[PDB]
């Protein structure tokens, strides 16, 4: 089956898609993320970072307290199941992880940790 989605995160606080499955025969699962857009990522900085539902708020309330030098991501936060990097315009990161992190079933969010930018950069991936 397909194991790769590619996201793109815009100048208007956008993800292309609201919804991933990821196919339970893939064994590893890759996120490519490009930013169409002018604005640099001190200003309009879009990651993709994947947690749980639960633990979705959290993630996101620890990554704006830690600033733009930790790409707003708490450091070592074991929350974090995948994640890219922050990136700005013209910029892409992909990033390939093991689907045996995944579970049935539950009830994934994924989103972005730029302050302010998960109101509409958020989605949700399933096992399926
Ligand atoms: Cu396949
Ligand atoms: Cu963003």
């Known amino acids: 089956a397909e194991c790769s989605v590619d996201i793109q995160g815009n100048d208007q606080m956008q993800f292309n898609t609201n919804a991933i499955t990821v196919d339970k025969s893939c064994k ?48 070592d936060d074991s929350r974090v199941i995948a994640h890219t990097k922050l990136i700005g315009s013209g910029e892409k990161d992909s990033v390939t992880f093991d689907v045996s992190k995944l579970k049935e079933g539950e009830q994934y969010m994924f989103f972005d940790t730029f302050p302010g930018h998960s109101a509409l950069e958020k989605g949700t991936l399933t096992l399926k």
């Open 28 to 75: 590893q699962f890759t996120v490519n993320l490009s930013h169409p857009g002018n604005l640099p990522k001190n200003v309009m900085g879009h990651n993709w970072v994947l947690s749980t539902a639960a633990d979705m708020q959290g993630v996101v309330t620890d990554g704006m307290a830690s600033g733009l030098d930790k790409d707003y991501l708490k450091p």
